[model samples]
Target: SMSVKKPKRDDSKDLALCSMILTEMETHEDAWPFLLPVNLKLVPGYKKVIKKPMDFSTIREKLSSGQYPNLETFALDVRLVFDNCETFNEDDSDIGRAGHNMRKYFEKKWTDTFK
Candidate 1:
């Protein structure tokens, strides 16, 4: 009888790294805007513009629940937050500048840790 072969997968390292990065991001000075989901009442048309709204709290929940299978998936969600910010605010706006700073910090941390 032939047996099926399945490749083993390990995500422990990625999970830990992602968790650490998320912690750093949550405490970042510019992290206030990204801590929670954008309020619908405060920002009209937010849902229409940001098809896939993402926030640090959501990402943290997802991470703790093991929703991310790899570093790439985690990175995608982080980027989404910044992308949404860019779409909603002007580069010179306070929120926009914060988003840019957060993005820069995340990218640097990513490279320093992974590369």
Candidate 2:
């Protein structure tokens, strides 16, 4: 006799969706500041303030390399980019405002795609 076990979810679809969102984010006008890691040379205190430094490039690399185990993990990295930006820059600053806009765009896309 055989026992029935719950089936595992198909994660390919989630990965594809994540890739699509990342591409859109990269093309967004507000994405410039987040496209790469914060230059430590330009902002030396960044490392001290934002413990977990994240960027769109790194997120894209992780997604491509299969480092993210699931969509939640992928989303966490994406959110981290904005969170770090907010922590390092004031709300009125250019990069800070970009972070805010990018975050809103991402959340809206996330909800529309998955939820």
lDDT score of residue 107 within candidate 2: 99
Best candidate, TM-score: 2
Expressed as tens digits, the lDDT of each residue in 1-79 for candidate 1 is 2687677666558788889999999999999999999998888899787899999999999999989878999999999
| lDDT (CA) per prediction | 0.93, 0.93
**TM-scores, in order shown?**
0.88, 0.90
**Native-referenced Cα lDDT, model 2:** 0.93
Tens digits of per-residue lDDT, candidate 2, 25-85, equal: 9999999999998888898798788899999999999999999999999999999999988
Instruction: Name the lDDT value of residue 20 in candidate 1.
Output: 96
Q: Which runs in model 2 stand beyond 4 Å of their true positions?
A: 1-10
Q: What's model 1's TM-score?
A: 0.88
Q: After superposition, how far is residue 39 of candidate 2 from its true place, in Å?
A: 1.2
- Backbone clashes for every candidate come to 0, 0
